[PDB]
Structures are given as structure tokens and as C-alpha cells.
RNA sequence: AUAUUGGCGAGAGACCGAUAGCGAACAAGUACAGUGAUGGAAAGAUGAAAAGAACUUUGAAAAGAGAGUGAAAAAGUACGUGAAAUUGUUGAAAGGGAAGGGCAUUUGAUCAGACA
RNA sequence: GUCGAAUUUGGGUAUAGGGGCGAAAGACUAAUCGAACCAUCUAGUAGCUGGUUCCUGCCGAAGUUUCCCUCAGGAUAGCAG
RNA sequence: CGUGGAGGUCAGUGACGAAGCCUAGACCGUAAGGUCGGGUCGAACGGCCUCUAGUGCAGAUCUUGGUGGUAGUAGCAAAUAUUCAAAUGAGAACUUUGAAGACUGAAGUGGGGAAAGGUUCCACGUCAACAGCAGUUGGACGUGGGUUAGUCGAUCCUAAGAGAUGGGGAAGCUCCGUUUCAAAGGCCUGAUUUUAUGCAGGCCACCAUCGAAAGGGAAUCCGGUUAAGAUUCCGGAACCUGG
RNA sequence: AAACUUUCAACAACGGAUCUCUUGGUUCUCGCAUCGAUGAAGAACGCAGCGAAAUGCGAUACGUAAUGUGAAUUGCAGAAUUCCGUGAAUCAUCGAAUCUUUGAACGCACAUUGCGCCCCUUGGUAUUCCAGGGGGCAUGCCUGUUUGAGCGUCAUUU
């Protein structure tokens, strides 16, 4: 159980922290797990989602599908994969808000900073 | 777009004054075009640029004044440390440890000593 | 407004509240290059000030009106 | 009162510019609690008391 | 203690044909004219507001407090009262259950649980982990949310890493001979927990 | 000019929703005005000092 | 006569807008605001006003200055500026 | 060492659970009332997700009626569950200045248990 | 009824609560006047009126003594559990 | 017996449907109440040995909220009064135009302002609500546009009064008083032709400020113009003040 | 015999109880010392590509700089090179600035967007009139400076 006196077990405060988090605090909340493919590759488990990652849906009605994130939507705690969508009655298509804890990242989008991210965390990266 | 702040610092005082008369004519153009069309989102960065030039103009002069009051008493009140009014009364560290020469001897003669209890 | 510009040779501006008829007559000459007979002002009941600037007969407000992009 | 002081007239103009309903696009926003304009004032209902 | 009294409410008296409790004065709002200050009124104070000088703790004679924890210790023998709490003891070799002291030096949670099972307490280790249910009250948003049963209690004379080893494994608690809480020897005031005595704790208990 | 109807277009609203949307605002006010007049008529006619023109 | 016919003669404002609290408590003939107290140096309040304090105390406005003092305290009332690291 | 119903930052409970808990869980000292000092509320909840009803027809329209979305419209922005007063429809019975109750059995409707 | 004067009335102004003002009626002082209005002391005090929330079993009264500025109330004894 | 929470236990029940609600359906109990069936419903909850309390309602001219009977009833009756046709519209006793008939009768039911309101003015669209009938009309609803000054007002002056200063009381909030027991101030130019203003004689003693859109007061008229502004805008003809 | 009244169940109404929730309250414990003439607390008026209010801000107006993180904001439009980068963002952090008219509020007033004066600079054929621009002009008290007042007072002298 908890030891430190600086951290809270209060359910009211946890749910207050979560729903009130600013954007830069939510980026860490939206971490998604890497595949059995990549975690032997990059030696790392999860990463904060980014807009261009390629991803596979491992839970829900959309299970088994895959695509590339269109927009990471941080008000809704949602990520929008294109190739996962639902069509309205009048033909306009609408995206399916997914929660990245239910996804798996197949291919990363690497920058200097993203390379630096995997640096700190114990990776190797080719 | 918008100006970058660190690229302006290199510019001289009187270039920026010319830079800023250009950005002002821009709005007088972009506020005429904003009543001919429904929306004109471009007008945001041009008036947040005028604030990025005025920040550097004013930043230069204030550290041109820090240099001509440098290293001497009585500099204008808005260049002084701010702190808080209770902490600007606040006898300075030099007027704190001020001690009469009587105790100054007493301190030196009998200061507090370190010791321990074993054997 | 535009019916005076194209008729009575009068430019109609939204001018700042702090400005008086001396500062207006001076900044019309400076920005738009013109010469002014007369300035009349009123504070609109949204809380802003309107100016009726009547250029001299040496000019045509219609000629300058469309130079800054409205007409 | 047909011949006015500027501090009054400046307060008539602030109440003229709050006199409009909600803009519609506000309702469409995520987590919107707001429904209608609850502070609408009317010269036939509540006098603003200067 | 200011709750409900923040109002200025006078009784309207009589003769206006409504009950005589104090009515909020004023107008134009719709709070105005409604009863106040009573315990029978909406928004008024309660009957007998609770107050913090209610006696909370309780003194118990230190000799009687000791009288109880020497019954709760004599009650962890006598197998029949252990079964009456649960505590599947059917498989255990005998009771009291005295383990070699080396259990006090075990450094790891993985190594500790392997020891309790090897002793034969696994039956009661499973009684927990099967029993976790939500709380049936409003105490679920008061941070009491999850409930469960109480596995064995381990008693050690000297601590080396054994308290942190077993602290994660659910429902299982550890105490020193020198302490022996009653709250941990008779939960709910029901005697006879199943206690695991280390050797050095079972001599020092004398 | 831009005929503020057109502003509503660009803003992400339709000249259709502007009816369906505003008529839900037009009526939802009444449920304030119907909840005020209902609770109101109970205690409003209570009057502090009333002379009772004659009683005998 | 003391009722609805007399309520018709009532058009002249006794009070006008106050500059300090802007509440229209300002009395025209006494030249005094009956809420803040202007033009008195001190701000009118009373310990029997327990609500009417809670209305106007500090924290019910913008706090254009005090807002930042607790932040500015924990740092030590620093001056100068931060330097840099990387990335 | 002591005091602290303010301030800042934290952790907690055998506390209240939207008529309760602060007056205020919501754009609450807010809307509103008064000349003023002052007085001062009401107001939480679709769904996992708007996927918030395209398309057809009658009607001037609101909507209706079908199809459609959804695990469910017995969730349609009057939206979780949806009680009681009270009401409309259908069915049953009753009725000579009230109605309603107790004991008793007949008549009508219903109910098991049991046997076998 | 009175209607050229002890007239009628607008605005400015002065007088504020045991105070003001009154050609006087205890009149008027923001529908409040034999002491205004608003908040606190205040959940003022009441020997006086009203109310006091589930079952069932066993037992079961008193309106009388003495004293009290005591007589719409208490102490005391008696009856009762 | 029942209710809201706490400790224990039944390795209790539950999206294969918890809780709740409706149920002249069944069972147990002397009773408070408990157990089951069916219907609606959707995420939590009980039995028992114990702990604790903001723990049980039919009334209090009880609090809050909702709703009845009365009842399609009381009434929607002052200010003389309307009618035909056409146009619009889905719809006309009520909107619009014409035609009639009337009325206020200039101490007006007209043409303008003061206090007060604050956008009610004007245009276009729209008719859910409001207009105690109706409504295509609206002082409503949604969107817009509109108030132009050297001369008109304020601004200035003082009235009745208010109110700093100097002082004087008062534990103090503040009170007295308004030129008062006050060292209360800046002018007119001569002296200067190093330079501008030293030094010069004389003076003048009223010595804050506030206080009137009806009192005092520098000066503007005619004609035309707008959907809505004009002694302000236009054209013309004047005038005042400071320099 | 219908209507009608009344009782009950069904489905549907009017109404919002009940149950289940909870980014709020409430009480107790722990740590901390931090408002303002260097203009506070409060007030008014303004600021958005489309905002009425709430939160944010001040004509640099939902923010400017700086710093960290490292690719959004999102109702729609938009921006895209700003995407292996001195760099997205209603982001955190915040040390440098801005800070309208006011307010202890200070040139004097203030029911007025009234009325001054002084110094520097600018225009109009102007040291004096008018305009524009920048910096000023409160009271009490303290230490010092300079200029003074008084047969209060000591000398100097002629």
C-alpha cells in the first residue's frame, strides 16, 4: 500500500485531478502500449501517443482493425484512428473515439525528441 | 507567421521603430478587409507581433538605463528590487549583526563551545 | 455612411474615444495625405466614437475611399 | 433622461451590448452545461436601476 | 455552527393566518416569506446540531485491557474457536502453529507467500482474494470502497525484512510479540484468529 | 456586407439548426417563467401591513 | 392617498452611482456613499454585517496583484531570468 | 514551548449525499426585491459513443405515420429509474337522500396445496 | 368647499429615532408611527396555547396533607413501577 | 420488528439482471413486519454475531414542493361606434388601402420639452411565448442601422447651504468653525542692453473649494435634406470671442 | 338499459418521490509566513476570426518576453513550415515587461469624462495666444541643504 504522506488516496481528489488536467498533463495519461513486435525492438513498454503513429485496436467492437491516428483529441481523452469510423444515415462518416489504453502501437513516428524519449527509458533503437 | 523575438534583438533601436510602423499599416489594411468578408483570422498574429516588437523595444531601453545608473546609489524606483513593502523596510543584513563592542568582546571572549558527554 | 462618401465628399471613421477633433484632423492628414475642412464627432450608443471628416474641395473622398480597400 | 451624463450613457451602452441571446455555436461545444442566456434584461421587465 | 442561522427571519406574529414560525422577510426573490431556523423548516438548522466535544475515545483500565489480550492469545490455541471464524485450519499440522524463526529473515514477497503455503496456510490465503466485494453503503465514496476477509497473522520476535515481505500479500498481517494488538487478535470481537508463531516469538511470549 | 446570417454559417451553424436551436432556447425560458409563476403565487400576496378597510 | 396615488409622485433619485464601490449607494445631498463610506478614507464595514463583509472582502474581485504573491513567494522573490538547458 | 472559524499548501474521517451538506455541487452573493442600509433563491443525471432521426408521404406548420440509429427510444436534447396525490381510455361490478367498516354465508373471479 | 391670497406647485436646501416637524389630530417622518426602518446581541424569556413518529406482553394511578407574593405553578407526604 | 453507517463472518447474491418501483397473485407472523411469483428496470446488494445514531409520523392555523374539488363556473359590461369592399394569407369582427359613419373640439385623444426610462426610435425578416378574445399586426421575437454644433445646453458665477486649511475638542470613529487669535500671495513694470530678469519704488489684502441643464450669462438665421438625425448635415446670409 | 358516481387492475398522462451515482460541502490533523505611496483590496469600462455570462487580461488587452516539455487547439473555420525543430499548445513554469479611467488616491475638483500651473520637445509667418508629444505639481513628519525673520541675543566696529 501507500507509504509517502505527500500522495493522496482520496477518491474525490483523484477524479478531480483527472478531469481537470491541462493538456500537457493529459499527454502522459494517453500513453498506449507497444506491440510484442516493437517492445523487443525498442526495449520499452508504453509511449505517449502521437498523431502519426500506426496502431491496432485490441478491444471492443472495432477489435482487429488498424490504421493511423488522425487527431489525438485531448479534451475527450480520445484518439481518432482513420480506418476506424462509422457512417451516419445521410452518408457523412464520423470517427470513432478510441481510448489509447485499448490500442497497440505497431509503428512509431520518430523525431529527435521522440528518439530522445526512448533514450531516457532504457531503449536501444537500431 | 509572426516575428520571432530573438531575431529582433539583433536589430538596432531605430530599425525596430521602422519595423513597427510597418506592422501598424498592416492592421489598417487588415481591419478594412475584416468588414468585407465574414472572417479574417490572419489579423491575430499581426497584432500579437506588434506586442513582440514593443516588448523588445522597451526591453532595450530599460537595460540601457540599468547601465547609466549602474554601480551607484539612487536608481529609479521601478528599476529597484520589488520584493514586498514589508521586506524593503527590513533592516539589511549589515544592520542586523551590528553589535556593541562590549558584546563583540563578550562574544569573542566567551562564545558557545562544542562538547560531548562520554568519558 | 457610404452614401455620403459617394455624394457629400465625407469620410466616416471609427475613431478612438480619447481622440479630439484636433488629433483627428491631424492624423487624417498624416495617414491618408488629405486636407480637411471640418470634423464632426459623436459617440455611438455602443460606446464608440464616430467621426465625419469632410475633405476639402481639392479632393474626392470617393477617390481615396477605395484606395484603402473599402467602397 | 434626454440630456445625459457620460458615465450614465457609458452604462446604457454596456447594457445594450449584453442584450443579445447566446450565439448558437456555444451549445455545440464539448461539456457544455449552458443552455440559454439567463441574464437577458428587458426594458419591459426589470429596470436596471441605472 | 453558523449553519441555518445566517438568515434574518422574524416571526410574522399572528393574525395573518399562517403558522407563527419565523419567516424570511424581504421580497422579490422567492426565498422571502419561507420558514426558517427550525428543525422543521427547509434550510433551517437541525435539531441539536452535532458538536465536536462529543466523547470520542474511551478509557479502559490498563489491567483490563491486558485482561482481554491474554484471552485473545489463549484463544488462538483451541482449534474449535479458530474454525468458528473461518480460518480453514483443517489441513494444518497442529495448533498453535510454530514455524522456525528463519521466516523472520525472508526478504521477498514471492519467497514469503511460498513459505506460508508450505506451512499449510494457503487455504486461508485463498479465502481472501476470493472475497473482495464492493461495500454496500455510501461508504464506497468515503474511501472504504473494497472489503475482504482476514488471513493469518504472523508473530515475530525480531524483524528482519519480514514485515515488508508480507505487507503486500492481501489480508495477511504481522505483529511483534512486544505489541500484540487486540484489534488484530479478535476482529469484530470474535476470538480465535489463526496465528503463525515464529520460534523466537513463541519463547519470548513467556 | 456579410449579412450576419452568413456569419452563423462560417461559425459552424446552419440556417436550419438556427431555427431548431433557437426554438429550444425560446421555449426553455418558459420553464423558468412557468416555474417562477407557480411557486410565486403562493407567498406573494402576503403583505406586511394591510389595513383591512373594514371589519365588523 | 398614502398608497398607489402617492407612489406616482416618486421620480427624484436620492442616490446616484458611487465611484469607489460603484453600487449606487452614493447619497446626493449628504455627499456620502452609504455602502463603502466614500469619501471616507476607511471602507465602511461592521461586525454586525457578517454577510455584507463576505460580499466585498478580498477574493471577490480580480486580485490583480495578490493573485501572484504566493507564487512569487515560494521562489524567493527572484530577479533576473532563467538560463537554459537543452531540447 | 503557547494561540488561530483568516491566508497559502497538503493529508484524512463510523461526517452530509442535491428539501441533506456552506446561502451557493450548476454563468451563487448569481437572477430578483428596496430610496438605502440590507435582503437573496431556484437550478445535478440520454448513451459506451450524437450514432440528436437521412429518406417517403398527409398537413401552412408543430408534429404525426412508416423506415432508420442503438444493447434499449418501455433512453428522442420535455431525455437514468419515474412513486403518490390527480387524470384520460378500456374492461369488470355497484347504485331509492352520502360513502366507507365488523361478524356470517350465498353468488360471481381467482389461488395454490394436495393427492395420487 | 374654496378659488388672488395665512394660495397652488417644480427643483435646490436644512432638520434623523426617545430625534425631527406639528395653524395640535399623538398628526406626519417612503402602504410602517402611543417611539420608524435594517443587522447583530437572539435559538431573548414564557408557571401560558399547539405538536411530540413502531408493535406487543406484564403492572397500573391522581385530582388529597403540609409550606410558599402560594390560587392556570412548585417543594413535601400519599397512591404507583 | 424496522432505518442510515462501522467491525467481523457466510471464499453470500448479481448485466444468465443488484437496488428501487407497480402487483382485489401466494406464503409465514398475535403484531410491528418478513419471504416468493409476474410486470417495469438497469449496477450495485444483502443474511446473521456485534458497534454506533441527524433512526420510524396522520395532525404542529407545521416547512418545501406538487396537485385537486369549486368550474368550463365568477366574470372578460366606464371612456357614445362601427360597417362594406378589395389586397395579403393556410387562416381576417381585429392586419393594409379605399369608401363611408363617427369621436377628441383646440384647458385636445393634437404639435413639443423637464424629471424618469434606455434603444422602446427605424428597417427588414419571423408568429413558440406575450399582447387576460384573435392576430398575417406589435412598444413582442431574431438581425441590423441610427443621435454630427465656436453660437442650443452643460462647462463659468453666485443664492439658500455644504466644506477643507490654520487652529480648537475628542480614549477614538470624528466634531466645531469658514476667515476664523495665521509669518496664509503674485502682480505692475522701472532698473539690463555682459543676459536675461537681478536688484528696484510702489503697490492690492477681497486670503480654498463646492453649490442652479427654471436664476445671472459672449455670439445663428432662412431654405433644402433622411427608412430613422438637424437652430448640428447641405447651400447660402451673418455674428461672437481669443490671437 | 345507457349516461353518471364510486372501487380495482391495465396501458398511457400530470408530477418529480424512490433507488443508484457525485470535479461540492463539512469537520479534524500537519506544514508555512507572504498586502499596499515601487500605488494594494475593491470598482467602472473595455479586450476574441465568430462570446452574452463565468474564468483570463489591459489600447503589448482570453495575453508580450523568458524558461521547461516536445506536436496540437477542436464547436466550426483556420494556420500550416511551426513539424529529425530556437518549435505546436485555452499546455505547464514564470525571474523580464505591459498595466485604460479610478480607488488609501496625491495638481484642484468630481451628480462634470470639468479646470489649471510648471519644465523639455514640435507644428502653425509666435518668450506672451492655440494645438500635438513626453516628464511633473498631495498632506503630516524626520535628517540634511539653501534662503531668510525677530533690539530674542552676544560681539564688531566707525
mmCIF file of N, CA and C (backbone and C1' of nucleotides) in Angstrom, chain G residues 11-13 29-31 40-42, chain J residues 114-117 162 173-174 210-211:
data_model
loop_
_atom_site.group_PDB
_atom_site.id
_atom_site.type_symbol
_atom_site.label_atom_id
_atom_site.label_comp_id
_atom_site.label_asym_id
_atom_site.label_seq_id
_atom_site.Cartn_x
_atom_site.Cartn_y
_atom_site.Cartn_z
ATOM 1 N N UNK G 11 -40.336 60.385 -8.511
ATOM 2 C CA UNK G 11 -39.361 60.311 -9.594
ATOM 3 C C UNK G 11 -37.930 60.779 -9.312
ATOM 4 N N UNK G 12 -37.623 61.387 -8.169
ATOM 5 C CA UNK G 12 -36.342 62.070 -7.993
ATOM 6 C C UNK G 12 -35.389 61.173 -7.230
ATOM 7 N N UNK G 13 -34.240 60.881 -7.814
ATOM 8 C CA UNK G 13 -33.324 59.925 -7.212
ATOM 9 C C UNK G 13 -32.612 60.535 -6.010
ATOM 10 N N UNK G 29 -27.338 64.520 -1.430
ATOM 11 C CA UNK G 29 -27.254 65.675 -0.539
ATOM 12 C C UNK G 29 -26.228 65.494 0.576
ATOM 13 N N UNK G 30 -26.132 64.315 1.177
ATOM 14 C CA UNK G 30 -25.100 64.122 2.186
ATOM 15 C C UNK G 30 -23.713 64.021 1.586
ATOM 16 N N UNK G 31 -23.613 63.856 0.270
ATOM 17 C CA UNK G 31 -22.345 63.600 -0.404
ATOM 18 C C UNK G 31 -21.598 62.446 0.242
ATOM 19 N N UNK G 40 -14.868 58.712 2.753
ATOM 20 C CA UNK G 40 -14.054 58.457 3.926
ATOM 21 C C UNK G 40 -12.847 57.642 3.517
ATOM 22 N N UNK G 41 -11.727 57.892 4.181
ATOM 23 C CA UNK G 41 -10.530 57.126 3.883
ATOM 24 C C UNK G 41 -10.770 55.635 4.077
ATOM 25 N N UNK G 42 -11.273 55.239 5.242
ATOM 26 C CA UNK G 42 -11.536 53.832 5.505
ATOM 27 C C UNK G 42 -12.833 53.370 4.861
ATOM 28 P P A J 114 -36.028 67.093 -22.370
ATOM 29 O "O5'" A J 114 -36.587 67.757 -21.044
ATOM 30 C "C5'" A J 114 -36.037 68.951 -20.516
ATOM 31 C "C4'" A J 114 -36.497 69.181 -19.100
ATOM 32 C "C3'" A J 114 -36.347 68.005 -18.155
ATOM 33 O "O3'" A J 114 -35.042 67.899 -17.631
ATOM 34 C "C1'" A J 114 -38.490 68.962 -17.905
ATOM 35 P P A J 115 -34.266 66.498 -17.635
ATOM 36 O "O5'" A J 115 -34.907 65.683 -16.434
ATOM 37 C "C5'" A J 115 -34.600 66.014 -15.092
ATOM 38 C "C4'" A J 115 -35.527 65.333 -14.122
ATOM 39 C "C3'" A J 115 -35.478 63.819 -14.100
ATOM 40 O "O3'" A J 115 -34.436 63.344 -13.277
ATOM 41 C "C1'" A J 115 -37.727 64.559 -14.113
ATOM 42 P P A J 116 -33.502 62.145 -13.761
ATOM 43 O "O5'" A J 116 -34.507 60.946 -13.988
ATOM 44 C "C5'" A J 116 -35.201 60.371 -12.899
ATOM 45 C "C4'" A J 116 -36.247 59.409 -13.381
ATOM 46 C "C3'" A J 116 -35.770 58.367 -14.370
ATOM 47 O "O3'" A J 116 -35.133 57.276 -13.740
ATOM 48 C "C1'" A J 116 -37.753 59.334 -15.164
ATOM 49 P P G J 117 -33.962 56.491 -14.492
ATOM 50 O "O5'" G J 117 -34.708 55.694 -15.642
ATOM 51 C "C5'" G J 117 -35.590 54.625 -15.350
ATOM 52 C "C4'" G J 117 -36.257 54.131 -16.605
ATOM 53 C "C3'" G J 117 -35.350 53.468 -17.621
ATOM 54 O "O3'" G J 117 -35.162 52.099 -17.324
ATOM 55 C "C1'" G J 117 -36.799 55.013 -18.697
ATOM 56 P P A J 162 -24.985 73.775 6.441
ATOM 57 O "O5'" A J 162 -24.165 73.059 5.287
ATOM 58 C "C5'" A J 162 -24.473 71.736 4.885
ATOM 59 C "C4'" A J 162 -23.582 71.296 3.755
ATOM 60 C "C3'" A J 162 -22.130 71.062 4.110
ATOM 61 O "O3'" A J 162 -21.904 69.804 4.700
ATOM 62 C "C1'" A J 162 -22.261 72.324 2.131
ATOM 63 P P C J 173 -10.579 59.954 15.415
ATOM 64 O "O5'" C J 173 -11.741 59.036 14.843
ATOM 65 C "C5'" C J 173 -11.454 57.761 14.293
ATOM 66 C "C4'" C J 173 -12.710 57.049 13.866
ATOM 67 C "C3'" C J 173 -13.634 57.839 12.957
ATOM 68 O "O3'" C J 173 -13.222 57.770 11.606
ATOM 69 C "C1'" C J 173 -14.885 56.799 14.680
ATOM 70 P P U J 174 -13.600 58.927 10.565
ATOM 71 O "O5'" U J 174 -15.019 59.443 11.056
ATOM 72 C "C5'" U J 174 -15.388 60.808 10.936
ATOM 73 C "C4'" U J 174 -15.843 61.359 12.264
ATOM 74 C "C3'" U J 174 -16.127 62.851 12.310
ATOM 75 O "O3'" U J 174 -17.441 63.160 11.890
ATOM 76 C "C1'" U J 174 -14.724 62.251 14.120
ATOM 77 P P C J 210 -15.182 75.142 -7.347
ATOM 78 O "O5'" C J 210 -16.364 74.315 -6.693
ATOM 79 C "C5'" C J 210 -16.268 72.911 -6.525
ATOM 80 C "C4'" C J 210 -17.349 72.396 -5.610
ATOM 81 C "C3'" C J 210 -18.767 72.794 -5.967
ATOM 82 O "O3'" C J 210 -19.322 72.044 -7.029
ATOM 83 C "C1'" C J 210 -18.442 73.172 -3.690
ATOM 84 P P G J 211 -20.106 72.788 -8.213
ATOM 85 O "O5'" G J 211 -21.552 73.032 -7.616
ATOM 86 C "C5'" G J 211 -22.159 72.085 -6.755
ATOM 87 C "C4'" G J 211 -23.225 72.738 -5.926
ATOM 88 C "C3'" G J 211 -24.058 73.768 -6.654
ATOM 89 O "O3'" G J 211 -25.049 73.200 -7.483
ATOM 90 C "C1'" G J 211 -23.401 74.637 -4.575
#
